Design a protein around this ligand. Structure first.
Ligand SMILES: *C[C@@H](*)[C@H]1/C(=C/c2[nH]c(/C=C3N=C(/C=C4\NC(=O)C(CC)=C4C)C(C)=C\3CCC(=O)O)c(CCC(=O)O)c2C)NC(=O)[C@@H]1C
Ligand SMILES: *C[C@@H](*)[C@H]1/C(=C/c2[nH]c(/C=C3N=C(/C=C4\NC(=O)C(CC)=C4C)C(C)=C\3CCC(=O)O)c(CCC(=O)O)c2C)NC(=O)[C@@H]1C
Ligand SMILES: *C[C@@H](*)[C@H]1/C(=C/c2[nH]c(/C=C3N=C(/C=C4\NC(=O)C(CC)=C4C)C(C)=C\3CCC(=O)O)c(CCC(=O)O)c2C)NC(=O)[C@@H]1C
Ligand SMILES: *C[C@@H](*)[C@H]1/C(=C/c2[nH]c(/C=C3N=C(/C=C4\NC(=O)C(CC)=C4C)C(C)=C\3CCC(=O)O)c(CCC(=O)O)c2C)NC(=O)[C@@H]1C
Ligand SMILES: *C[C@@H](*)[C@H]1/C(=C/c2[nH]c(/C=C3N=C(/C=C4\NC(=O)C(CC)=C4C)C(C)=C\3CCC(=O)O)c(CCC(=O)O)c2C)NC(=O)[C@@H]1C
Ligand SMILES: *[C@H](C)[C@H]1/C(=C/c2[nH]c(/C=C3N=C(/C=C4\NC(=O)C(CC)=C4C)C(C)=C\3CCC(=O)O)c(CCC(=O)O)c2C)NC(=O)[C@@H]1C
Ligand SMILES: *[C@H](C)[C@H]1/C(=C/c2[nH]c(/C=C3N=C(/C=C4\NC(=O)C(CC)=C4C)C(C)=C\3CCC(=O)O)c(CCC(=O)O)c2C)NC(=O)[C@@H]1C
Ligand SMILES: *[C@H](C)[C@H]1/C(=C/c2[nH]c(/C=C3N=C(/C=C4\NC(=O)C(CC)=C4C)C(C)=C\3CCC(=O)O)c(CCC(=O)O)c2C)NC(=O)[C@@H]1C
Ligand SMILES: CCC1=C(C)/C(=C/C2=NC(=C\c3[nH]c(/C=C4\NC(=O)[C@H](C)[C@H]4CC)c(C)c3CCC(=O)O)/C(CCC(=O)O)=C2C)NC1=O
Lengths: 161, 160, 193, 48, 161, 160, 160, 161, 161, 160
């Protein structure tokens, strides 16, 4: 995986080039938006389980999924789905702090689509839950970091879909 | 960078980031402009630092430029100067990134097998790096000089 | 060695490659029912018959309208000549190549589609236009298909296909101008009289 | 007066085309008048 | 029409020259990329309708062209536009197989500009659709034949424009 | 060439290339290096092949170089040998293309009419071509010899 | 087959087989043993392929097993699986024959009228064939996998 | 008219694009061949009359063209024919300096053919004279610019024929 | 794995046959060359690192592989590449000692091709380095064991290719 | 210099200057600025080159600084360094002049006799000259490095 700074450093090391004005501009661009990211991450960590609760109630629950015959039926499958939601929110927080989707591409999206296809998981329901937690985090974080937080949730939803 | 080292442990234990990690990220991000200004001067003085460093290295131990030495010959000496320039570039990378992830992944891991296959004196390479540290410190303010000296010191320690 | 070298060196090659008759005269295929046996080769003959007639542009729109004709042709109830004749009797041909043009350009379109050339001379325009106006398309097409020229060139089973005539005079450029025109590209009658 | 357009690309002429190939070789292959320690740490490709 | 081999043969025949080192090098350069052309042509033939569908969706439809007053308004004009679009795809495949735009000049581009001027077809829209299939075919075929497929689509676009 | 003939059928039937056509294209491009080697070998032995073909032709039927012969005189014998050189070039073109469309378009269609107009013996020209085939096959390995002999027999049959 | 197509295109010109078509014939006979081995390998695992591909198809396109679906109901699903087995048998036939001549005459031409009359989703059949392709290529070596995937891709494109 | 520089500039202006690497490469390739064109043009200008005399002697005169009833019979037509050859040579020099046959198309070839059928001039004889001048000019200019000079004479001959 | 002796023994055990004249002849043929194999193995064991060093000098370094963007660029990749070379040398020594490429197939070649394909390792460059090691070993060992050592290096190169 | 050599050749031949001689004259005068720059660089770096060459020479020939050596003692080593400075000045003279006339007339004619009388190792002088060559080439761009190395190599060869 890589963050923005290490990504620029690697992108220049591959060319064998010293850090010039454009690269330092990218680095300063990441440096300026530092505060909103850590504050959004702290509020998300503090409100993680509440976020999962509203996201479930808003996108998945009170439907045919929770009823018998659905994928979310039984406490085992419900615990699996809520653990997956907590996982997704945690790695979205990681990607938001790192300013890069490489960690999501590596440790999350790799093989998930085929495995969910094999297990019968609803991809549309997963995307809806991801968007619900995106909405709740956008509400919680405030205007400082809502957009940056939303971009990586959109990345996860787009990669799954 | 600081981001990778502060995210890898969080991923390892499986939690969101702890407030000490967040505030060390604050110190790192607040020092960003000064880090960029520090790295710019070393790039301005790129081809002039290495010329001073090579002279002090060869004065400290001329045997590498001796007929039985690894650096004997014009092209051999040019290759050693190129390696010193490589490590200066890596030091600038570490200075801007705020940690040693790029430096480690590019030029220290396996460097022992590197210089053992090439039969090049690693302790000689260490003095060559330290010469670059001295010449770089000579052209920076005291706080910035100490800041760059930390990364030069890390490279010297990892090289041996 | 020097007696087979060009003289006045061809400083720009492939400016001399394209001279002479076009490559299209010999870079196309002719289809015959007698050697078009089997299902795979029969479909090529059928799709080629829709391109000689209908001129390749509104031929791609044909999906299944001529399905009884193809069945009889495949069962050897009608020859390729009968298939080509019945293709000219259909409403699609009349709609496309007769309903939007003067009565003389219909003769030119009929000649280029069922014989492969343009009109020979003025004594042929008088014969084949004074019959189309007397009895419409279903007599003009029957005259062309049953003529001596069609029997000589194509006989029973052969798609008409373009021919690049040498004689009579002004039949080569007149034919080639018709050949290198897309459908609705130009509607001037080329050989008015 | 109709526009007369262009049918021959200027880069296909003998002199220009003969200079373009030399321009490629001189920029990619060989070094030049900066110090050899700088010229031995160069990557000829830019993003590959 | 000509391919690379027949083009070299005719270019040497008009000067009365036996095949020398330069002509042999040209033929060798063509032969070294023979298999990639065949693979790309097979992929394009297998994915023909999808290339047209995504190209039309990306460039033509959902605009004033499909609305009344547009050139591709009504089912007849829509069918004509997609048939033309397919013509461009098939002749681009022929050009990429033969390694020469001679077939494109001989059987497609001649009279096409003034024909579209007579019929009122939008040449800019046609160029947009051709570039749409260029992007789609570049996505499908891969790094191996992307640029070689792209050169003939650029040839068609430059001929129309 | 085979590419042209496949594309011509595909465009006549208004369809993409069939898998069989793609396979023949693949084999056709696979055989390219051996074809280019054969064409190179014939191109390097141009002068010898032509001279020996002329010598065998005149040995077999000397009447053409007699006073009442078509090729009597130095400047007339030069044209006959130039015609043989033309046909050797056409054979090399055919070998490189893989089949006889260049040979057909350049040297056989109408050859009867041209040689009847010039009043030269077409049977003599055919034997002259056959001698060229013998000299050419004398300089090739067996498989390449048969490969070139196919085109030489095509020319001999066409001039008939 | 390759023999059938070569003979038919030779008889189109009413001439004996060219040497290039003979090299076609030798290549096809040399590859025939590998083709029959691949077809036997696919034949041994026919049930697993159709079962897993049907599961994959129902995963991707659930509307066909929805109330407004052509294959809604258990017997309608069984008919879909029988059709998939038919297509697998046709692909094995194509692999052994080398040329795709039997597949086109048996289960390609007229399949549009097939699924239009039966009101079945041709894109859904395409998705099922693609899943069959994936599961079949999972059980084969890379060259054999590509050899089978070419015929699978013909099926997917020709049901377009 | 237009030279190589204006051709590149117009080709980029029609797209409204600033000059990029390809445009700069084309401009550099033109600029490198500057002195050779000037030297060839100076040689042709100095040897203009001898080239015309030798081309006329080799291709036109001593024949039915100059004998009575010929198109070059009488001083009135002989002077006109040599003036035409001078015009062709001068415009070929202009085209060689510019590195573009646009001047040949705009100021030489348009209307020239139908003018020649109007007057009765033999087009084949004119082409033969042009090629004789081409051979002489290629001899004079040297190996440096022989191909560059010959290309424009071939362009003129192909346009006329 | 198996040597020549073990291969013959197994090939006769699969028929349940006692050793006959042909098997004894094969065993004699292997036994007659035992000393040269041991000498070449001792020489290779002595000069293993030198063989690697000149192999790398002639085939790998001072190229784009070493520059930024090369597969052997960076200390980690260079160490991995030289470890691969010493692996090839040791297993070639094993193969030449045992008189059988069975050990090369079992413990070297299987998985290596697609492993390099996934890793991005240049198979052509690795084959060239293996050939350089082969030529160095052949020069070092002498005429007695040159072909015997070179056959296994060619086996490794062919298996990679 | 170059002009002196051309003039002396023309005088010995009894003719005026050849156009090729004027060509080398124009090239020599055009190269004057670059030669002056190289001389200025070496003059400014005269101390470093001499000192470093002394250290490298004493590493390859430790016995010269030893009890039975020519340069045993502080002032004996100072004399050796002064000799190396003399040869550096002569190389600067040769670079500015364009050939080796001043170097020849000052430092190689009879140098064997002088060092034989002084009992001085001439191969050690040559090693010192090579060390000065390497140190000087370390301070110059590639083209100027080769240009100065020409004169250094000539000095090494003539001191043999
Ligand atoms: C909103 C939740 C949706 C849902 C999910 C669901 N998931 C499973 C089971 C698994 N999920 C995973 C996931 C991962 N493995 C990884 O390595 C990563 C990234 C590091 C992920 C995200 C895996 C491997 C499994 C299977 C093993 C396990 O259960 O731990 C299940 C259980 C299904 C079953 O019982 O087979 C569910 C229900 N289901 C929904 O309906 C929601 C939309
Ligand atoms: C001395 C010969 C010159 C020459 C001629 C040439 N002509 C053609 C092709 C054609 N010539 C005609 C002629 C006629 N049209 C008529 O109606 C008749 C009477 C029946 C005549 C005389 C036509 C129509 C063509 C084109 C069709 C055809 O080829 O039959 C060619 C061949 C061009 C080619 O193959 O592309 C040539 C060479 N060429 C010379 O160099 C001489 C001066
Ligand atoms: C993306 C579609 C665009 C468009 C096209 C359009 N085209 C027509 C009509 C014709 N197009 C052709 C084209 C060809 N004939 C050829 O032989 C070739 C090359 C082999 C080509 C490209 C021709 C000849 C016609 C006229 C005959 C016919 O209609 O088939 C039309 C119909 C116009 C009308 O209604 O009269 C359209 C709409 N229109 C768009 O808006 C797109 C940009
Ligand atoms: C993946 C399954 C899809 C699907 C299929 C479906 N098929 C039928 C019925 C028939 N299918 C065939 C097929 C063939 N006959 C042939 O000769 C060949 C070539 C080898 C084929 C492929 C036939 C003949 C039938 C009719 C019944 C019979 O076989 O006697 C049905 C049932 C339709 C009905 O109305 O009952 C279905 C559902 N449906 C899907 O949703 C899938 C995409
Ligand atoms: C102070 C100089 C010392 C010295 C060095 C020396 N190095 C080489 C050759 C190489 N060094 C490298 C180095 C790197 N590759 C990497 O990716 C990195 C990380 C950025 C490094 C540092 C490489 C690849 C080579 C091989 C040649 C090449 O670059 O293409 C040599 C030459 C050895 C030879 O056999 O030619 C020398 C002499 N020598 C000394 O004496 C000093 C202590
Ligand atoms: C009742 C005495 C207690 C109580 C319960 C309560 N439950 C819910 C909501 C849900 N309960 C379930 C339960 C299950 N799903 C399963 O698969 C199984 C195993 C068979 C169980 C037990 C689910 C899925 C839901 C969510 C809604 C849905 O089914 O779709 C609620 C509503 C909570 C809300 O926020 O609306 C309540 C109140 N409440 C009490 O006071 C008792 C202690
Ligand atoms: C509705 C009952 C069904 C349906 C329709 C559907 N249509 C589109 C998109 C288009 N439809 C047209 C149609 C016409 N253009 C014409 O000129 C005429 C003749 C009067 C018609 C009928 C066109 C042009 C489009 C493209 C968009 C545009 O108009 O610019 C869609 C959208 C498909 C997409 O991929 O976006 C849909 C869904 N879908 C159903 O399920 C019904 C059966
Ligand atoms: C003779 C007294 C002087 C002389 C003459 C000379 N003339 C030529 C060649 C040509 N002369 C002509 C003349 C005419 N063409 C016309 O239409 C008219 C008007 C009726 C005239 C007078 C031409 C056309 C030629 C070219 C050859 C040809 O006719 O085809 C030559 C030969 C020049 C050469 O070979 O280069 C000569 C020598 N020369 C003298 O010294 C006399 C004073
Ligand atoms: C510009 C022309 C020029 C030269 C070169 C020159 C040289 C020179 N070298 C001297 C001494 C010396 N030169 C050397 C040199 C060497 N010892 C070694 O081991 C090596 C072989 C070598 C050094 C690399 C030594 C050792 C002496 C001292 C000899 C003594 O004191 O007896 C002396 C005697 C002392 C004096 O200078 O008064 C002279 C004159 N004079 C000139 O006018």
């Amino acid at each position: 995986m890589q963050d923005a700074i290490t990504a620029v450093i690697n992108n220049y090391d591959v060319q064998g080039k010293y850090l010039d004005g454009a690269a330092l501009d990218k680095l300063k661009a990441y440096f300026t938006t530092g505060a909103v990211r850590v504050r959004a991450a702290a509020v998300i960590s503090s409100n993680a389980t509440t976020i999962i609760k509203e996201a479930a109630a808003k996108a998945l629950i009170y439907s045919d999924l929770t009823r018998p015959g659905g994928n979310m039926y039984t406490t085992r499958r419900y615990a699996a789905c809520i653990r997956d939601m907590d996982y997704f929110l945690r790695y979205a927080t990681y990607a938001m702090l790192a300013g890069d989707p490489s960690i999501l591409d590596e440790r999350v999206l790799n093989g998930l689509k085929e495995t969910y296809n094999s297990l019968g998981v609803p991809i549309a329901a997963t995307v809806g839950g991801i968007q619900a937690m995106k909405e709740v985090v956008g509400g919680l974080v405030g205007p400082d970091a809502a957009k940056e937080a939303s971009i990586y949730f959109d990345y996860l939803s787009s990669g799954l879909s | 960078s600081v981001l990778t080292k502060a995210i890898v442990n969080a991923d390892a234990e499986a939690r969101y980031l702890s407030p000490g990690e967040l505030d060390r990220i604050k110190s790192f991000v607040a020092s960003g402009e000064r880090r960029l200004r520090i790295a710019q001067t070393l790039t301005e003085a790129r081809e002039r630092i290495v010329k001073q460093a090579g002279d002090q290295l060869f004065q400290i131990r001329p045997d590498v430029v001796s007929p039985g030495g690894n650096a004997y010959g014009e092209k051999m000496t040019a290759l050693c100067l190129r390696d010193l320039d490589y490590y200066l570039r890596l030091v600038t990378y570490g200075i801007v990134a705020g940690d040693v992830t790029p430096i480690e992944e590019i030029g220290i891991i396996g460097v022992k097998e590197m210089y053992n296959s090439l039969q090049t004196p690693i302790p000689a390479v260490a003095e060559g790096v330290r010469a670059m540290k001295n010449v770089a410190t000579s052209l920076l303010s005291g706080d910035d000089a100490a800041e760059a000296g930390f990364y030069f010191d890390y490279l010297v320690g990892a090289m041996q | 060695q020097e007696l087979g070298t060009p003289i006045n060196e061809r400083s720009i090659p492939e400016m001399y490659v394209n001279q002479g008759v076009p490559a299209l005269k010999r870079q196309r295929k002719v289809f015959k029912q007698s050697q078009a046996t089997d299902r795979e080769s029969f479909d090529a003959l059928v799709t080629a018959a829709y391109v000689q007639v209908f001129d390749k542009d509104i031929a791609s729109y044909i999906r299944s309208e001529f399905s009884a004709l193809e069945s009889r042709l495949r069962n050897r109830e009608t020859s390729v000549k009968e298939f080509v004749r019945l293709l000219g009797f259909s409403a699609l041909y009349r709609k496309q190549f007769h309903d939007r043009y003067p009565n003389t350009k219909v003769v030119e379109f009929a000649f280029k589609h069922f014989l492969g050339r343009a009109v020979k001379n003025q004594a042929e325009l008088i014969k084949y236009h004074g019959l189309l106006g007397r009895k419409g398309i279903k007599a003009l097409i029957g005259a062309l298909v049953d003529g001596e020229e069609y029997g000589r060139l194509y006989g029973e089973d052969t798609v008409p296909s373009w021919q690049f005539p040498t004689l009579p005079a002004a039949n080569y450029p007149n034919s080639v101008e018709l050949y290198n025109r897309f459908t609705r590209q130009d509607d001037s009658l080329v050989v008015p009289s | 007066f109709k526009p007369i357009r262009s049918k021959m690309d200027i880069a296909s002429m003998p002199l220009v085309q003969a200079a373009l190939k030399e321009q490629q070789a001189t920029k990619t292959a060989l070094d030049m008048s900066r110090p050899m320690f700088l010229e031995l740490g160069r990557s000829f490709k830019g993003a590959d």
